[PDB]
């Protein structure tokens, strides 16, 4: 079967991280949308203009809003992308056929929206050469960050080719986790985000979203289907594109 995949990137990144997966998925007959979230990729906004994960999630929300009644899509988020998914699912669940998590965070409904973000910081406390800053928005102080080049090379693009790593050093922009804001945000609902089929995809070779964390996430919130890719790194859509596409196909054939 054919499906409409909406590929959601993580912070400090853009749609470009899907430059390989997108064409391959279409080569399978699928409709693929790769969105740029606020102040990400070639989006004209700057991070200082964003005041929350919800605002940051704007593009995805508007994309969904524009879908004609009856059309369902499959959201695919990577790393911090799972949060964008939960935010949208609580506003457009009828439109989501399923949601795939690609080495991503898996929020739940029993805890605050920052729960898994906080846990990640516990397992991966040292972001190496990453630098931070602070700006103010809507009376809240936000911690902005720009991913360190060494961190990218060693923990994110570990097994990626130099030509791919190069793109990261030329395209990654200032971003934010909006962690303190998430802490005060309303819990994701069980009726919306809770009702959607969730497929968790990961590799125990991820140098940042370490096994302890990802395994911790599966036990905390039991996914509907778990797929464990063998090998690769954090960026499986680059190091294991073919495999990922194989799974997405299986998902398209299972959920609609």
Residues near a second copy, by CB under 8 A = 14-16, 19-20, 22-24, 27, 34, 41-42, 44, 46, 162-167, 170-171, 173
Cβ neighbours for 103, distance < 8 A, ≥ 6 positions apart = 78, 79, 201, 202, 203, 206, 209, 214, 234, 235, 236
Count Cα atoms within 13 angstroms, Cβ side, for 30. 27
- The answer to whether 115 and 94 are in contact (CB under 8 A) is no
- 79 is annotated as an active-site residue: yes
- 176 is annotated as an active-site residue: no
Rounded least distance, CB 166 to a second copy, Å: 4
Rounded least distance, CB 131 to a second copy, Å: 17
Indicate the residue among 34 and 105 with the shorter CB distance to a second copy: 34
List 40, 52, 79, 176, catalytic entry: 79
- What's the Cα-to-Cα distance from 106 to each of 4, 30, 41, 103, 116, rounded to whole Å? 22, 25, 24, 9, 7
Indicate the residue among 45 and 225 with the shorter CB distance to a second copy: 45
Rounded least distance, CB 226 to a second copy, Å: 28
Indicate the residue among 101 and 165 with the shorter CB distance to a second copy: 165
CB crowding 169-178: b at 16 or more within 10 Å, else e: eeebbbbbbb
- Find the helix or strand (DSSP H, E) in which 24 lies: helix 21-26
Indicate the residue among 95 and 174 with the shorter CB distance to a second copy: 174
Rounded least distance, CB 104 to a second copy, Å: 20
Active site residues: 79, 234
């Amino acid at each position: 079967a054919f499906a409409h995949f909406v590929l959601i990137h993580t912070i400090c990144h853009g749609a470009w991280i899907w430059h390989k997966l997108k064409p391959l998925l279409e080569a399978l007959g699928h409709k693929v949308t790769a969105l740029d979230l606020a102040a990400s990729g070639v989006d004209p906004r700057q991070i200082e203009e964003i005041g929350s994960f919800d605002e940051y999630s704007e593009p995805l929300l508007t994309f969904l809003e524009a879908l004609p009644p009856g059309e369902k899509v499959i959201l695919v988020g990577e790393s911090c992308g799972g949060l964008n998914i939960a935010i949208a699912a609580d506003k457009y669940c009828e439109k989501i056929a399923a949601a795939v998590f690609h080495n991503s965070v898996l929020p739940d409904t029993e805890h605050c929206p920052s729960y898994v973000v906080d846990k990640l910081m516990e397992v991966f406390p040292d972001w190496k050469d990453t630098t931070y800053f602070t700006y103010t928005k809507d009376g809240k102080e936000i911690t902005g960050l720009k991913l360190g080049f060494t961190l990218l090379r060693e923990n994110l693009y570990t097994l990626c080719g130099p030509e791919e790593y190069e793109l990261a050093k030329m395209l990654t922009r200032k971003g934010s986790l909006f962690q303190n804001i998430l802490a005060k945000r309303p819990f994701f609902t069980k009726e919306g985000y809770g009702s959607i089929k969730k497929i968790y995809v990961w590799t125990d070779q991820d140098e940042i979203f370490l096994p302890e964390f990802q395994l911790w996430q599966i036990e905390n919130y039991k996914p509907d289907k778990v797929y464990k890719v063998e090998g690769g790194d954090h960026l499986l859509q680059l190091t294991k594109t073919k495999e990922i596409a194989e799974i997405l196909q299986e998902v398209a054939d299972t959920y609609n």
